[PDB]
């Protein structure tokens, strides 16, 4: 039983960091969204001048 | 759909499962346990106890006392044959 508990001695202190910075990398991307509007906007600029 | 959170639900966890009733069983056994042999009263005499530590413990242990109340009773009934026949 020591050393289950033992296993569980630093926890906190990294998953206090791996619950802030995994959010984040999941939630730092809406520019990247906000980005593909502009870039599927010069693909079909693109798209059709081609066509011309 | 977010950060899911099970790392850290130790703290109310510690009371259902089977090694905690046996470790609250223990650390309440291993207190009040005497530590090398002590208070084990070595020495103790109320006009009769004295027979009990040197024949009737567990390192002698014999039934040679048991000879000398038979003894006895050869000090008894014999002399109650002197006292009847």
């Known amino acids: 039983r020591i050393d289950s508990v033992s296993q569980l001695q630093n926890v906190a202190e990294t998953t206090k960091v791996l619950f802030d910075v995994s959010k984040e990398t999941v939630e730092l991307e809406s520019e990247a969204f906000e980005l593909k509007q502009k870039v599927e906007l010069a693909h079909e600029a693109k798209a059709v001048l081609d066509s011309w | ?85």
């Open chain 2, 1 to 85: 759909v977010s950060t899911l959170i099970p790392p850290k639900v130790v703290s109310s966890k510690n009371i259902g499962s089977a090694p905690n009733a046996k470790r609250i069983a223990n650390v309440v056994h291993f207190y009040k346990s005497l530590p090398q042999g002590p208070a084990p009263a070595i020495k103790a005499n109320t006009r009769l106890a004295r027979y009990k530590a040197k024949y009737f413990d567990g390192d002698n242990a014999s039934g040679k006392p048991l000879w000398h109340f038979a003894l006895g009773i050869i000090a008894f009934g014999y002399s109650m044959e002197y006292y009847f026949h």
